Design a protein around this ligand. Structure first.
Ligand code: NAG
Lengths: 49, 49
């Protein structure tokens, strides 16, 4: 409403806005072996997957 | 919050009901205790027979 009558009102939150982001991952260097599972010379049979 | 923006009517009625309850509590206290309009002081002497 554009008009508020005399009194005390409990306000829902609208005021806080975050502004900055934090990224915190484990520090790992090795690339994951995509070539061992996608470039493999021979795959297994479906029964012995 | 952007998703909840369309349930503003639901939240407004919830807050209206709670505010009504809150005002009603103060009203109940006023009716029970604030009947007398003057704060009488006990007399210095306690000669109550
Ligand atoms: C997979 O094999 C191809 C050659 O067939 C090669 O060009 C490519 O770099 C390899 N990819 C990975 C992730 O090892």
């Amino acid at each position: 409403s554009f008009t508020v009558e005399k009194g005390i009102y409990q306000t829902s939150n609208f005021r806080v806005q975050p502004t900055e982001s934090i990224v915190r991952f484990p520090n790992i260097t090795n690339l994951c072996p995509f070539g061992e599972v996608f470039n493999a010379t021979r795959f297994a049979s479906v029964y012995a997957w | 919050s952007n998703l909840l923006l369309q349930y503003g009517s639901f939240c407004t009625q919830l807050n209206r009901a709670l505010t009504g309850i809150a005002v009603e509590q103060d009203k109940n206290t006023q009716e029970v205790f604030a009947q007398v309009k003057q704060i009488y002081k006990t007399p210095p002497i306690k000669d109550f027979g």
